[PDB]
Design a protein around this motif. Structure first.
Motif, PDB file in Angstrom:
ATOM      1  N   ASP A   1       0.795  -1.220   0.000  1.00 17.46           N
ATOM      2  CA  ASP A   1       0.000   0.000   0.000  1.00 17.46           C
ATOM      3  C   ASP A   1       0.827   1.270   0.000  1.00 17.46           C
ATOM      4  O   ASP A   1       0.514   2.252  -0.681  1.00 17.46           O
ATOM      5  CB  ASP A   1      -0.966  -0.065   1.176  1.00 17.46           C
ATOM      6  CG  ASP A   1      -2.110  -0.995   0.832  1.00 17.46           C
ATOM      7  OD1 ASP A   1      -1.995  -1.509  -0.294  1.00 17.46           O
ATOM      8  OD2 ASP A   1      -3.082  -1.239   1.575  1.00 17.46           O
ATOM      9  N   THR A   2       1.885   1.246   0.800  1.00 17.50           N
ATOM     10  CA  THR A   2       2.734   2.414   0.929  1.00 17.50           C
ATOM     11  C   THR A   2       3.485   2.671  -0.367  1.00 17.50           C
ATOM     12  O   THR A   2       3.680   3.822  -0.780  1.00 17.50           O
ATOM     13  CB  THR A   2       3.760   2.206   2.050  1.00 17.50           C
ATOM     14  OG1 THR A   2       3.013   2.133   3.263  1.00 17.50           O
ATOM     15  CG2 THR A   2       4.751   3.385   2.162  1.00 17.50           C
TER      16      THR A   2
ATOM     17  N   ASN B   1       0.635   3.905  -2.958  1.00 14.79           N
ATOM     18  CA  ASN B   1       0.012   5.184  -2.662  1.00 14.79           C
ATOM     19  C   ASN B   1       1.011   6.334  -2.582  1.00 14.79           C
ATOM     20  O   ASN B   1       0.653   7.495  -2.786  1.00 14.79           O
ATOM     21  CB  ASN B   1      -0.822   5.037  -1.398  1.00 14.79           C
ATOM     22  CG  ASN B   1      -1.891   3.986  -1.595  1.00 14.79           C
ATOM     23  OD1 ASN B   1      -2.266   3.744  -2.741  1.00 14.79           O
ATOM     24  ND2 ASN B   1      -2.355   3.349  -0.527  1.00 14.79           N
ATOM     25  N   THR B   2       2.274   6.005  -2.331  1.00 13.57           N
ATOM     26  CA  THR B   2       3.343   6.996  -2.476  1.00 13.57           C
ATOM     27  C   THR B   2       3.452   7.444  -3.922  1.00 13.57           C
ATOM     28  O   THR B   2       3.411   8.636  -4.212  1.00 13.57           O
ATOM     29  CB  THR B   2       4.709   6.493  -1.941  1.00 13.57           C
ATOM     30  OG1 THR B   2       4.568   6.042  -0.584  1.00 13.57           O
ATOM     31  CG2 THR B   2       5.830   7.535  -2.092  1.00 13.57           C
TER      32      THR B   2
ATOM     33  N   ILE C   1       0.251   9.440  -4.906  1.00 18.78           N
ATOM     34  CA  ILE C   1       0.370  10.737  -4.274  1.00 18.78           C
ATOM     35  C   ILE C   1       1.413  11.680  -4.889  1.00 18.78           C
ATOM     36  O   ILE C   1       1.142  12.874  -5.005  1.00 18.78           O
ATOM     37  CB  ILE C   1       0.379  10.576  -2.722  1.00 18.78           C
ATOM     38  CG1 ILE C   1      -0.514  11.628  -2.058  1.00 18.78           C
ATOM     39  CG2 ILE C   1       1.772  10.653  -2.093  1.00 18.78           C
ATOM     40  CD1 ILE C   1      -0.440  11.776  -0.541  1.00 18.78           C
TER      41      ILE C   1
ATOM     42  N   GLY D   1      -8.907   5.275  -4.586  1.00 19.82           N
ATOM     43  CA  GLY D   1      -8.738   3.884  -4.956  1.00 19.82           C
ATOM     44  C   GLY D   1      -9.063   3.050  -3.728  1.00 19.82           C
ATOM     45  O   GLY D   1      -8.563   3.357  -2.662  1.00 19.82           O
TER      46      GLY D   1
END
Lengths: 142, 137, 139, 142
Positions: B35-36, B39-40, B43, B57
């Motif tokens: 996820d990190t 989503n990094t 973002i 999402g």
């Protein structure tokens, strides 16, 4: 969207209380947390019915694969239960199937799977599943 | 799975309580890295619709195979690519590597469906987003 | 609020997507995770062979935190650390978290380790190599 | 000295999770604050009508602390006790303690402070009546 397992398909249930931080920024239980539920449900059973000794046991189970499909959201502080069954039971490995239900309720919100390999704690070489665990895992079959 | 199969990399440092009672990064934490890592990217690269929150999402499926253990304080590297790219959904493929190394310790995937915030009704992926996702195929 | 120059050791710590809670900011429990990561990284890199091989371990017996300004994923944080009191078996750490371009800490707190034999949890004198590492973080 | 059950007004069981245990085999010190967060917000939502999804006023933590007296481990059963120490215009100080099932002396005990704020701006606000009433219900002169 996506066939939703029913309660009657599972052989053993365990309630798990939701925590404040189970919710993500979208206001429901984050998808990663489901795997924490899986881990919790399975090992609780192994401790209680298989005599798994997580502090000093010579044999332990390691997750070698897992998956999850998410059908409907849950949120802290709702009450949830995990249904648990064993699909394939091998010589050193075991395949669990799990589903999360909103309590008293019929269709799973999420369902998945994962595999333990049993290993010598202090080496991590695969071992035949000890009998007392074998019998607890079989009790969860079919 | 090898390093060169993935298009985009993100280092992630482990935390003390990443380790479980058996002394390695708990299997659940790998999903957090998944996820990190995604989503990094979204973002930093995914557009104003992503960045401001009108389009989000949601994860609808995920999975993971674990090949070799990692432990705090090891530094890890997440490799990322996009496999299928649909009208409102995308399937990511990820793999965790130790620094310097070609063979993955762990590898999995997950799907986002993109949705309006208020309704959680599926939306066609905004163009700036689509570009950013296509860049990883 | 605390300032950077009041600490002796600094480490960056990056955030994770799910650090955020429902209100959109790093949840207040994650700050203690930072404190532990910061101190345990130092102990591992500097703490001595008794720490490093695991005959002696530190256990947390108290902790606290003041929260001043919020942090959010994907912001990157600078952890300042120092040692306040250093006893026979125990140590008090003081920490503060900073964001790039705020002078003042966003959050600050403290915790106590008691060093103990791992197989029994009985308190031990701090091993020399560890004590030396800790003393170096006293103002 | 460890706090006792009879010193708390409100109790809430929380189920332990696999990953609550750290490498030393017991519930990590950090997890205790997730119990604090969980116990307090469950009470605010159930008794105070806090609306965490769309409410206009939320509680933010401005300080917290904990003392740890004896270890607990997954899969033990634990209960949080809760009372309100100080209750101000826009803020409240909670006292919490963790107990093992059917034990009188706390395993750990601490506090935390919420400030209530308008969610969009985080400006402090007078505690809404319905929340104040719920908090005052946890104050004792005993």
């Amino acid at each position: 969207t996506a066939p939703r397992p029913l309660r009657e398909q599972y052989l053993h249930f365990q309630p798990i209380s939701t925590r404040w931080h189970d919710n993500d920024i979208y206001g429901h239980v984050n998808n990663v947390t489901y795997y924490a539920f899986f881990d919790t449900a399975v090992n609780t059973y192994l401790i209680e019915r298989g005599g798994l000794d997580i502090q000093g046991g010579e044999v332990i189970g390691l997750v070698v694969s897992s998956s999850c499909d998410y059908f409907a959201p849950v949120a802290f502080p709702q009450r949830i239960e995990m249904g648990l069954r064993v699909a394939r039971l091998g010589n050193s490995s075991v395949q669990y199937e799990l589903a999360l239900f909103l309590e008293g309720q019929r269709e799973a919100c999420a369902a998945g799977r994962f595999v333990h390999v049993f290993v010598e704690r202090r080496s991590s070489r695969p071992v035949a599943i000890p009998q007392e665990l074998r019998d607890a895992l079989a009790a969860l079959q079919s």
